[PDB]
């Protein structure tokens, strides 16, 4: 990619992130304007300020002076600082430069403002119901619940073996309670099911690994 | 003020067309350039082109060239976006965004709220109820398979049931269908006496079901 | 370089309350030629607001007529709201009858 | 009526 | 009298908002009589004087495939210039071109002018003589040379010492009850105290035709070039121009100033008096 960003970055209230927009290798930093806009949940993308240098800049009227653009020549990249962190600051953030006939954006970077501890999942596993290997599908529901910072990483073991083939897995959505959950899908024939001794719901959240299992 | 304000969502299939319309208020209509960028669900920003609304001029980006057509009703301050032999890689939220004359800062000034586009073979088709069975706290769902679009509403009770409901968010299988789970962790010695029934509806196809969910 | 605009708020003939004018904003010696310009009443933006074509001075220097068809009252205010590169907020000239 | 054929820079 | 005929032309690179822009303007003396956006609907050479509007479909047809072949040269020079001084795809650059020629009371050739810009700096200018060229800088020096080669200074000389002045004389003769008409400036004086000490004495020239006036305060006899505040001349909107000179004077001194106007509309120069 010619803009890469970083998936996502974290950091506590009062504090400072460093936000960066890398430009592909012999692509110069140095000539372009660097726009950054901030994107908040259900609504379109806003322009925060344009960098091309210290004498060539640009930063909106609405935009508080906590928020700054640099380049970094040595890494090739842009810079978005924010300075004493607010909650308010949470959003999707993306740079974009004209290149080649072209606007071009960066994947974006999703920004949390620590506002809460590390809350370990709970983690529910149900087995196929009856009622479904009936009609000759089977279904094992994984719900991951009560989670901060709001990120897993899920995986299924057939009698202990990796199972990649058949998983369906939601992004992380916001609970009323201000935390996260997800669910897993893992999808089988009723003959894959009743084959195994033991399924395994294994979802890992900040290094910690919560596992359930269901057998038949 | 300035205002952009869009059509509705949209459901297509593959190799059909979708014509959005992004109407304009508060500056003169001709005196600005509109461009187009895309936005696919949980994903980055991708930009389209540009219609000069005074002159009828366009141009598109190498990727949707032979596909796009961007037009503009100055009687009625509404520009155009028309995208043809749509695939589902083309499912996206749609922005219309108005660019600056003053160039110093903001290149997009003012956006539209978005207009999302969803690019599927499947027809409408309601849900595949099935009972999440629970085994001093116990857990307990259902789970609404296979249908098609979003969204379907879930309650428990006829609503008498809000306290530990949570309704996940739909997870889109390979199939081109959606499917979620709605769950209610409960007292375990209410499961023997207290009765719990989920109801679905799902609006598009108009079917609604009531599902009692009992142990084992 | 890069030149500020010079504004003029005036009309096409003498102000005569309840009389039928053309209010003007000329904006001169600027530079570069991206320039925005709103002519104002009681501080709402006249939607009908047309300009000249875009030409230059000596030194390069552009400028443009921005006019609209407007009847001088005793109590409404006119003014003209300027934005170019050169500026860190939008300028506001204001008509004055005397000039 | 403005200058018919002019050369590239 | 002595006339002239002038074209502007503005070329402005827009990444990423757009193509680049092209306005054509074209003026006899003070009028514009025809215009050329490439921002607007029609994409021709468009009517902006009435004497203009009896040229024939083939005048109209010549305009805008010249004027469009005008905008198409300027464009490829943006970014030629671009290459020349090492500037970024993402900036914006500005070249502007401006040629004419002046004729006498007779209707003969005066003199003829070409000069370029760019980013609102000299380039490039054909010299007195109509046979070489006047390069800014370096890169200007490569535009000189291709020119040079390419006999640019001889194709200008023919056009602005034939065809230019048989056209300026045609719009002069179509356009008479206008064009060759001067309209003098309609003067008055207004009073405006600043305290018990001092007063604003302000000359209005209004209506006149065309925009070269000169206001000159005085004080029994002498210039006040130094204390005279001088507005730019505006256009009135209907084809005339506006003007005013002020000058701050002792609250019992307004007899001791007059102001003179000099305008070709006026047979003798006017002197206002409060």
New interface residues.
Partial sequence: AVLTQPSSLSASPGASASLTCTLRSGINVGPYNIYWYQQKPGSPPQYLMRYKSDPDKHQG?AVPSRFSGSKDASANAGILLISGLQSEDEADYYCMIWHNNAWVFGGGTKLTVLGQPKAAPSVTLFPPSSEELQANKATLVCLISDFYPGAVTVAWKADSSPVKAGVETTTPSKQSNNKYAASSYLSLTPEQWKSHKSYSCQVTHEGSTVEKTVAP | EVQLVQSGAEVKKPGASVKVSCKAS???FTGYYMHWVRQAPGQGLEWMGWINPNSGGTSYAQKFQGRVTMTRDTSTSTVYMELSSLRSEDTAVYYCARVT????GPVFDYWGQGTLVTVSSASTKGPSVFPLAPSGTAALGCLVKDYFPEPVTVSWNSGALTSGVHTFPAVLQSSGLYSLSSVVTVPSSSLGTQTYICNVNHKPSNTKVDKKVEPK | ?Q?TP?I?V?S???AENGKSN?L?C?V??F??????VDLLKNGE?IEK?EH?????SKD???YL?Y?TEFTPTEKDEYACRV???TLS?PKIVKWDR?? | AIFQSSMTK | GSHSMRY?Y?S?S?PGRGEPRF?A?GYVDDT?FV?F?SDAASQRMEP?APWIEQEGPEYWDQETRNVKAQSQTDRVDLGTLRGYYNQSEDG?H?I?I?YGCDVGPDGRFLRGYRQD?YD???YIALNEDLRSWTAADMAAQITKRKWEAAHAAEQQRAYLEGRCVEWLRRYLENGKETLQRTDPPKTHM?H?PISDHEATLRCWA?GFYPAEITLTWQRDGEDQTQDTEL??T?????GTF?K?AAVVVPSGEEQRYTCHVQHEGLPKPLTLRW
């Avoid at chain 3, 530079?31 to 925005?36: C, K, Q, V």
């Avoid at chain 5, 505006?234 to 209907?238: C, N, S, Y």
């Fill in positions: 009227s | 508060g500056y003169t004359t003053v160039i110093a | 370089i030149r010079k003029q005036y096409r003939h003498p053309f003007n000329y001169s010696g530079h570069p030629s991206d320039i925005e933006r607001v000249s074509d875009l030409s230059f390069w220097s552009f007529l006019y934005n170019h590169v907020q005397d000039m | 502007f503005t402005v827009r306005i303007v514009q215009r956006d902006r914006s500005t502007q401006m810009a609102g700096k000299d207004t405006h209004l507005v730019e505006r256009p009135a909107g209907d506006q005013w």
